[PDB]
RNA sequence: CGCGGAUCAGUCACCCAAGCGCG
């Protein structure tokens, strides 16, 4: 199957619950999706964040699924960040997500009901309700896929 | 590459050190 990458920012309070005791949860998730998942270590934050990074590699569907799981776990806090997803895209993909004078991010936001913003990489922050975020991430991933 | 799993890690896995191998 065709393999793709997704980098997601995880607040440190959520990492415990996505790895699980002795790694059980992350293993299961990797085994069930076929995805490979790597978190940066506890104090390895994305430049100018307090967030760890989660490298996911797998099929388009596995990326949406892994990210769906991560979102859920983040939604169970120890305020703004409860309902955001941040992902890291190459400048190339960043360019594709925006679109001619912002047409594309506007289309995405219409289709999702999410509020999407962009900060050699940029972080994309998606804002809204679970199903809204999940929808926008699907469109974003689709544009990760389509960039050669 | 395989076994291993120091130290880190506080739901902490994978990766990574010693050490011991197979090719
Ligand atoms: K090993
Ligand atoms: Mg091992
Ligand atoms: Mg080794």
Report the C-alpha gap between A138 and A144 in whole angstroms. Answer: 10
Cα dihedral: A58, A125, A145, A36 (round 10): -10
Angstrom distance (rounded) from CA A84 to CA A97: 17
Tokens at residue A44, please? 């390895």
Note whether A142 and A93 are same-domain residues.
yes
Structure determination technique employed: X-ray
- Give yes or no: residues A39 and A89 share one domain: no
- Collapsing DSSP states into helix, strand and coil, what is residue A23? helix
Indicate whether A138 and A112 sit together in one domain: yes
Comparing CA positions, the residue from A50, A58, A56 lying closest to residue A70 is: A56
Are A71 and A90 members of one domain? no
Enumerate the β-bridge partners of residue A37. Answer: A56
Chain breaks in chain A (C to N over 2.5 A) after: 78, 119
Are the C-beta atoms of residues A125 and A135 closer than 8 Å to each other? no
CA-to-CA distance for A118 and A94, rounded, in angstroms? 8
Q: Provide the pairing of β-strand A121-127 with A115-118.
A: antiparallel
Which residue range is the domain that position A109 belongs to? 79-148
In the three-class reduction of DSSP (H, G, I as helix; E, B as strand; rest coil), residue A65 is classed as helix
Q: Which two tokens stand for residue A45?
A: 């934050």
Which CATH number is A131's domain given? Answer: 3.30.1370.10
- Report the protein residue whose CA lies nearest the C1' of nucleotide B13: A23
Token pair listed for A116? 């999407």
**A55: nearest nucleotide, CA–C1' criterion:** B14
Q: Which residues are in reach of strand B, CB within 7 A?
A: A 12, 15-17, 19-23, 25-27, 37-43
* Cα–Cα distance for residue pair A131/A101, rounded to 1 Å: 26
Q: Using alpha carbons only, give the angle A138, A140, A141 rounded to the nearest 5 degrees.
A: 65
């Amino acid at each position: 199957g065709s393999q793709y990458f997704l980098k997601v920012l995880i607040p440190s309070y959520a990492a415990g619950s996505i790895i699980g005791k002795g790694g059980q949860t992350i293993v299961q998730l990797q085994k069930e999706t076929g995805a490979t998942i790597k978190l940066s270590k506890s104090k390895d934050f994305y430049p100018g964040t307090t967030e760890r990074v989660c490298l996911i590699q797998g099929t388009i569907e596995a990326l949406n699924a892994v990210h769906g799981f991560i979102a859920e776990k983040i939604r169970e806090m120890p305020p703004d960040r409860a309902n955001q997803v941040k992902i890291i895209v190459p400048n190339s993909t960043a360019g594709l997500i925006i679109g001619k004078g912002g047409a594309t991010v506007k289309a995405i936001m219409e289709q999702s009901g999410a509020w999407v913003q962009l900060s050699q990489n940029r972080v994309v922050t998606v804002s809204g309700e679970p199903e809204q975020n999940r929808k926008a991430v699907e469109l974003i991933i689709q544009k990760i896929q389509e960039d050669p």
